[PDB]
Ligand binder design. Structure first.
Ligand SMILES: CCCCCCCCCCCCCCCC(=O)O
Ligand SMILES: CCCCCCCCCCCCCCCC(=O)O
Ligand SMILES: CCCCCCCCCCCCCCCC(=O)O
Ligand SMILES: CCCCCCCCCCCCCCCC(=O)O
Ligand SMILES: CCCCCCCCCCCCCCCC(=O)O
Ligand SMILES: CCCCCCCCCCCCCCCC(=O)O
Length: 581
């Protein structure tokens, strides 16, 4: 590589290059208007083509960081707007790059992106496809400035694919808004996992990260040897150290090295990787991360022969403890893709705890011969809740199931704000939908994925304005004990029933004109506020107050003079409901 830009432009192509340079600049300079970044992109691009044409041409010998910082420092509004960022420009490059990273603000005071009417978007899409898309790519990019750029680009192409389909359609909103909802969900889910991988590495350490990674890579490449899994977990640990630090260009260099490696040693890693390795430079790593489990080898020995019965277990443990526990977790994991990653680490921590007592003890082989019995119950805890909650989701719909949860959690933690309880109850139910459609074989890894990002979001909102110490306990616990902690919460026996507020239980005639989505949030808020007023109420009592409410609405949204009904029946509903509690 005589020219780094020339090469990236060859490996990426003009279109991909422009998009990535835009995303890159919208991530450092988050307050400049769209049309200034377009001028910048086109000048960086005009210059890249100079180097493609002639590797020896003026300025083509320079580093990507060096060229990037230079173009950043040409902006004249820079001092007046960003201030301290401008002071970086005084430095020489190795120090200067580090300075632009220190002054990258996650979430500035930027207004929420309004979704326009479907009609507005489709007309816009048709009339100038490109500038419609880059303008929206520039908006997401300035708001989520630590969102790895190629993944952001990958989402972009799926928005483009949603409009191409749904603007030439029968009914646009019913086509498009679900596509856009599924995408928004994944963009929010993906942004949470990057945040979470990085918070995990810092708050818990290199050791629990590798543990997590070994469990993971072994479930997915079960035919690979442990030496090979080690090698991948080493390089992945470097990858995330670096990608957390924020240097887009060095983060991208590492992931691609990893994908180049994995595709060459494909033979000795996984059969299900042929497709991902035919894909071009940009997509490779992203694709490999999404790869399916390889099938495990047919008849695989039970583990007690080497980790429980055999002598020289302690003599193997003591030699190198973490590598032997690694040996273990690999072996356990590759036999059990139906387990959550955290289940497997709960087990490996259990085997650790015993080998500590029993290898320092009078008789080793005897003290720990029944260690596998400790597993049995640990395994059944998450399996039972999935048996039980997907039983309940099947009886009631998605929506009525959300209301079971909302009553459950409001009783466990009644101090939490109402919009928050309503929101997480609704997501838990959505997890219900996506995960209960999988068979027992796949349910626990499904939940692990969705619960971890629902639970991370929960602990952030709590960090900001705390509310319960029991919730603070669950959020300042190991990653392995996060979900059992939430699960171990009991109905708050201390909670003082809150003051009845009349207004809270008054319904006007507008809840007939609302959407199904809005109606549900209105009613759901009233259920929370009801469980907060009468915590000590039975499933039959609350089923009765609920059904009285079902008839009351149905009676008033199907009669002449809807409004006087809603205040006259309303008087009656409240008094009768007061009395039955
Ligand atoms: C990524 C590039 C986005 C281009 C599509 C813009 C429309 C999306 C509106 C926002 C939303 O769905 O919440
Ligand atoms: C490839 C080598 C990686 C090393 C893997 C070590 C296996 C560790 C098993 C314990 C899981 C982490 C739980 C620690 C909880 C705690 O510190 O309280
Ligand atoms: C003045 C220079 C501006 C910067 C030039 C564009 C930089 C884009 C680099 C992204 C390359 C992505 C490499 C593949 C890694 C991956 O697959 O995740
Ligand atoms: C799945 C149903 C989702 C409904 C939310 C309430 C039940 C959540 C329990 C799921 C178990 C999580 C498994 C992760 C673990 O191994 O600890
Ligand atoms: C701002 C903090 C909000 C706190 C909300 C507390 C409600 C608890 C939610 C727990 C859901 C996790 C699944 C637990 C499974 C179980 O019920 O056993
Ligand atoms: C004293 C308490 C006053 C109680 C007023 C009645 C409020 C109940 C509203 C709960 C909404 C239930 C929705 C159930 C459904 O139809 O799906």
């Amino acid at each position: 590589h005589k020219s780094e830009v020339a090469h990236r432009f060859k490996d990426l192509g003009e279109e991909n290059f422009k998009a990535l340079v835009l995303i890159a600049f919208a991530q450092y300079l988050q307050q400049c208007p769209f049309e200034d970044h377009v001028k910048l992109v086109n000048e960086v691009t005009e210059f890249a083509k100079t180097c493609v044409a002639d590797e020896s041409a003026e300025n083509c010998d320079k580093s990507l960081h060096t060229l990037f910082g230079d173009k950043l420092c040409t902006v004249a509004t820079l001092r007046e707007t960003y201030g301290e960022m401008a002071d970086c420009c005084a430095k020489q490059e190795p120090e200067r790059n580090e300075c632009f990273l220190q002054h990258k603000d996650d979430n500035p005071n930027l207004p929420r992106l309004v979704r326009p009417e479907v009609d507005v978007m489709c007309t816009a899409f048709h009339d100038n496809e490109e500038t419609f898309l880059k303008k929206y790519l520039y908006e997401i990019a300035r708001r989520h400035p630590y969102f790895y750029a190629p993944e952001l680009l990958f989402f972009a192409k799926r928005y483009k694919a949603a409009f191409t389909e749904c603007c030439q359609a029968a009914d646009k909103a019913a086509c498009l808004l679900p596509k856009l909802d599924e995408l928004r969900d994944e963009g929010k889910a993906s942004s949470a996992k990057q945040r979470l991988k990085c918070a995990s590495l810092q708050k818990f350490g290199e050791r629990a990260f590798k543990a997590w990674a070994v469990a993971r890579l072994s479930q997915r490449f079960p035919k690979a040897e442990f030496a090979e899994v080690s090698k991948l977990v080493t390089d992945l640990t470097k990858v995330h150290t670096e990608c957390c630090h924020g240097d887009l260009l060095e983060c991208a260099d590492d992931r691609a090295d990893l994908a180049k490696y994995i595709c060459e040693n494909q033979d000795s890693i996984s059969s299900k990787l042929k497709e991902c390795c035919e894909k071009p430079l940009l997509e490779k790593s992203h694709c490999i991360a999404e790869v399916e489990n390889d099938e495990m080898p047919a008849d695989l020995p039970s583990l007690a022969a080497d980790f429980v019965e055999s002598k020289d277990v302690c003599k193997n443990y003591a030699e190198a403890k973490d590598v032997f526990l690694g040996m273990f977790l690999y072996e356990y994991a590759r036999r059990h893709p139906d387990y959550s990653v955290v289940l497997l680490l709960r087990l490996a921590k259990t085997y650790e705890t015993t080998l500590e007592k029993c290898c320092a003890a009078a008789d080793p082989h005897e003290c720990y011969a029944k260690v596998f019995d400790e597993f049995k119950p640990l395994v059944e805890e998450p399996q039972n809740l999935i048996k039980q909650n997907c039983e309940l989701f099947e009886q009631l719909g998605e929506y009525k199931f959300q209301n079971a949860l909302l009553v459950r959690y409001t009783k466990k933690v009644p101090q939490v704000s109402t919009p928050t309880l309503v929101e997480v109850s609704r997501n838990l139910g959505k997890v219900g939908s996506k995960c209960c459609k999988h068979p027992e074989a796949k349910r626990m890894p499904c939940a692990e994925d969705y619960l971890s990002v629902v639970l991370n979001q929960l602990c952030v909102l709590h960090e900001k304005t705390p509310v319960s110490d029991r919730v603070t306990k669950c959020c300042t616990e190991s990653l392995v004990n996060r979900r059992p902690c939430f699960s171990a919460l009991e109905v708050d026996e201390t909670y003082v029933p809150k003051e009845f507020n009349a207004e809270t239980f008054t319904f006007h005639a507008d809840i007939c004109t609302l959407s199904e989505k809005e109606r549900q949030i209105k009613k759901q808020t009233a259920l929370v506020e009801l469980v907060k007023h009468k915590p000590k109420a039975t499933k039959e009592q609350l089923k009765a107050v609920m059904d009285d409410f079902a008839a009351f609405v149905e009676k008033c949204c199907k009669a002449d003079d809807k409004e006087t009904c809603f205040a006259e029946e309303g008087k009656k509903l409240v008094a009768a409901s007061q009395a039955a509690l």
